[PDB]
Amino acid sequence: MKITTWNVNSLNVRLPQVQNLLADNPPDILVLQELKLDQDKFPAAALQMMGWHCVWSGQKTYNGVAIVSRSVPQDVHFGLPALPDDPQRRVIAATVSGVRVINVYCVNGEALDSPKFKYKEQWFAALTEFVRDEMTRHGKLVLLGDFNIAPADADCYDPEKWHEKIHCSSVERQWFQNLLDLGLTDSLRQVHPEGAFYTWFDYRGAMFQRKLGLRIDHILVSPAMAAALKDVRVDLETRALERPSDHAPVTAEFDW
């Protein structure tokens, strides 16, 4: 089984690339963040007509998350029970081929002194509660997406420049640890304990061409999935395309 997560930085813009990714060596499940499309503007026909089932949660301009799979997604769930009236479209879950898939587009946070950083804190607390509950029922569970958190200094290029800055702060790293502490494994680091595996590269300054990025897109797995884990890779071919998303897809492959 292959599961890919990709922050597409607008699905309107990236649709042809999503289509090309589904057409050649496709994953079994592709989850998307930053649709940036209202619910009724999601290109459902374009993907469905390719033989893919889609569930999604969109809003105008911002955010937006989708799950795309050749299996029909079951028991679809939207949002966070502990933050039930947040209008921001950031969490969608569904059971796909017996695996509980929770797709997140986590709060960026902006800056440690931004009011959006307090939002980030409360939002992560709410996510932890939902994930903890979901894990009591599904032995095969995958929590994946753009976490907007770089777990350790190997995940932030030039770590001295990012010392207690957004994405790379000690407190953000604690929020990421709180998810692992539920009984989940950072899949990429199980397979590749050492080395840079950046998933986001700023468009400004040609950072992708300079190899300078953050590892903020992750695939967190329950033990039953960890035991079956074969590889985790960052799809830099897709990031190297003309007019790319600033994030690269990340794929985990499971082998039983």
Q: Which distant-in-sequence residues (6+ apart) come within 8 Å of 68 by Cβ?
A: 18, 22, 29, 30, 31, 32, 47, 52, 53, 54
C-alpha span between 113 and 66 (Å, rounded): 30
- Tell me if 148 is assigned to a ligand binding site: yes
Output 149 or 234, the one with its CB closest to Na ion: 234
Which one of Na ion, Mg ion, none interacts with residue 148, CB within 5 to 8 A by kind?
Answer: none
C-alpha distances out from residue 15 to 1, 11, 37, 43, Å: 23, 5, 12, 8
Running DSSP on this structure, what letter comes out for residue 114? S
Give the three-class secondary structure for 241.
Answer: coil
Instruction: Of 101, 108, 247, 125, give the one whose Cα is nearest residue 174.
Output: 125
Residues that bind Na ion (CB under 5 A): 233-234, 236
Query: Is 247 an active-site residue?
Result: yes
- Tell me if 34 is assigned to a ligand binding site: yes
Query: Is 38 an active-site residue?
Result: no
Query: Is 62 an active-site residue?
Result: no
Least distance (Å) from Na ion to the CB of residue 62? 7
- Tell me if 77 is assigned to a ligand binding site: no
Sign of dihedral through CA atoms 210, 199, 58, 178? negative
Instruction: Of 9, 63, 58, give the one whose Cα is nearest residue 18.
Output: 9
Sign of dihedral through CA atoms 72, 221, 183, 151? negative
Least distance (Å) from Mg ion to the CB of residue 10? 7
Of the listed 75, 119, 146, 186, which one is catalytic? Answer: 146
Of the listed 105, 138, 155, 186, which one is catalytic? Answer: 105
Q: Where are the beta strands (DSSP E) in 8-61?
A: 29-33, 53-57
Output 53 or 116, the one with its CB closest to Na ion: 116
Return the residues of window 8-67 that contact Mg ion according to CB under 5 A.
9
- The stretch among 6-14, 64-72, 104-112, 167-175 that binds Mg ion (CB under 5 A) is 6-14
Which one of Mg ion, Na ion, none interacts with residue 9, CB within 5 to 8 A by kind?
Answer: Mg ion
Output 9 or 169, the one with its CB closest to Mg ion: 9
Q: Are 220 and 187 in contact (CB under 8 A)?
A: yes
Output 15 or 236, the one with its CB closest to Na ion: 236
Which one of Na ion, Mg ion, none interacts with residue 233, CB within 5 to 8 A by kind?
Answer: Na ion
Which one of Na ion, Mg ion, none interacts with residue 221, CB within 5 to 8 A by kind?
Answer: none
Catalytic residues: 105, 146, 247
Residues making up the annotated binding site are 7, 9, 34, 146, 148, 246-247
